[PDB]
Design a protein around this ligand. Structure first.
Ligand SMILES: CC(C)(C)OC(=O)NCCCCOc1ccc(S(N)(=O)=O)cc1
Ligand SMILES: [Zn+2]
Length: 257
């Protein structure tokens, strides 16, 4: 099955998921000089004060922190979005080295990791329905660079030892995702896709301009996770990112001058 290795990685995904060569695939390179300021954009509304985290899971491709999305508890609105998008999970992509790891790039620069907060459009009832719609998801993307530690990330880092291998999960309640946000909500936005199979073209991407900084110790603990299940040969979970895809007939819009 699909992965990030030499024999099942991004270059192979099109064989099972032909949409991999589609017209609105993600991630992309964000060329800052060609992104256009769009005064018609509204401010982002991030309302996470009643977020209810449930669990953290190693799914063999990344680790997901899952939320109760059966009510409007943590929602994204405004910006390019019409309607209300509910937070369902967040996860990261990261590298084996500090100079790679992000999926989006900025003027071809790669960051050490990238955070994806995944939301679905409540007009579609559930996540499974939403991924089948062109405007079904909104993913908030946040770059990570290595520098000072991110205090709000440490509770995630501390539990990773309990979910080392594929299939392992742990209780993870009362986590506040607001502690993962940068100061500024300035963003770029464009229409795209899931960056993993099934690569569905259902995502409005909102990528924040300002990265958060994490410590080398924090990202080193990401790199100790395993792709494999317990009792299988150990393969470190690193470089779980898809490279930039052709922009084709798309324009990136910026919320800022
Ligand atoms: C039957 C099946 C599984 C083919 O249909 C599904 O319902 N697809 C479910 C979608 C699961 C993928 O979840 C994500 C993958 C990647 C991202 S990312 N890296 O773009 O933010 C988000 C969700
Ligand atoms: Zn992702």
């Amino acid at each position: 099955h699909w992965g990030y290795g030499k024999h099942n990685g991004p270059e192979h995904w099109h064989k099972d998921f032909p949409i991999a060569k589609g017209e609105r695939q993600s991630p992309v390179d964000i060329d800052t000089h060609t992104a256009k300021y769009d005064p018609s954009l509204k401010p982002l509304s991030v309302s996470y004060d009643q977020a209810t985290s449930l669990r953290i899971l190693n799914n063999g491709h990344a680790f997901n922190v899952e939320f109760d999305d059966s009510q409007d508890k943590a929602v994204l609105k405004g910006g390019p979005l019409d309607g209300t998008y509910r937070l369902i999970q967040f996860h990261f992509h990261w590298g084996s080295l500090d100079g790679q790891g992000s999926e989006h790039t900025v003027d071809k620069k790669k960051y050490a990791a990238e955070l994806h907060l995944v939301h679905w459009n409540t007009k579609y009832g559930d996540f499974g329905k939403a991924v089948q719609q062109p405007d079904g998801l909104a993913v908030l993307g946040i770059f990570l660079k290595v520098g000072s530690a991110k205090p709000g990330l440490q509770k995630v880092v501390d539990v990773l030892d309990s979910i080392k291998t594929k299939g392992k999960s742990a209780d993870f309640t009362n986590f506040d995702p607001r502690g993962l946000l940068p100061e500024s909500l300035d963003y770029w936005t464009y229409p795209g896709s899931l960056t993993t199979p099934p690569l569905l073209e259902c995502v409005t991407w909102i990528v924040l301009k300002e990265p958060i900084s994490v410590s080398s110790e924090q990202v080193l603990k990401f790199r100790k996770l395993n792709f494999n299940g317990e009792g299988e040969p150990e393969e470190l979970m690193v470089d779980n990112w898809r490279p930039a895809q052709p922009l084709k007939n798309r324009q990136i819009k910026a919320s800022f001058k």
